[PDB]
């Protein structure tokens, strides 16, 4: 689904892009922004590509930003 | 074996049980600062650069 039911906590979308316009970096990749949310480290949160997820269980799926001034930001995403 | 000491652990630790506790608060989502404060054992004694993680920056 491409939208969200209530925080998005099984929000297995392709939305890439957070609320401020800003593609999301790839969760396998750690350029330019380091992190430990590792795709082998959580399998089971679907950390495919740059989608948008939600590991920590947050109210809104989030990601990191591409821009070196944004460590992470949140994704607008629609709700069913 | 009880004196051969296996690398295969025993208990499996569950990440969802953790995850009902709620212990981390959002806190670790929120600021990475924590994290830094638990990879080094003391802090730095001279002048620590710090700066944000970046290729250019």
């Known amino acids: ?80 | 074996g009880s004196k051969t000491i296996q690398e295969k652990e025993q208990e499996l630790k569950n990440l969802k049980d953790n995850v009902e506790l709620e212990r981390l608060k959002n806190e670790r989502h929120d600021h990475d600062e924590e994290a830094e404060r638990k990879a080094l054992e003391d802090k730095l004694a001279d002048k620590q650069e710090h700066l944000d993680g970046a290729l250019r920056y």
């Not at chain 1, 740059?50 to 709700?79: A, G």
């Open chain 1, 1 to 80: 689904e491409e939208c969200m039911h209530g925080s998005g906590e099984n929000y297995d979308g392709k939305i890439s892009k957070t609320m401020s316009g800003l593609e999301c970096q790839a969760w396998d990749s750690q350029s330019p922004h380091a992190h430990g949310y590792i795709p082998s480290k959580f399998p089971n949160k679907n950390l495919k590509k740059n989608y948008c997820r939600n590991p920590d269980r947050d109210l809104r799926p989030w990601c990191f930003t591409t821009d070196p001034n944004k460590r992470w930001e949140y994704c607008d995403i629609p709700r069913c």
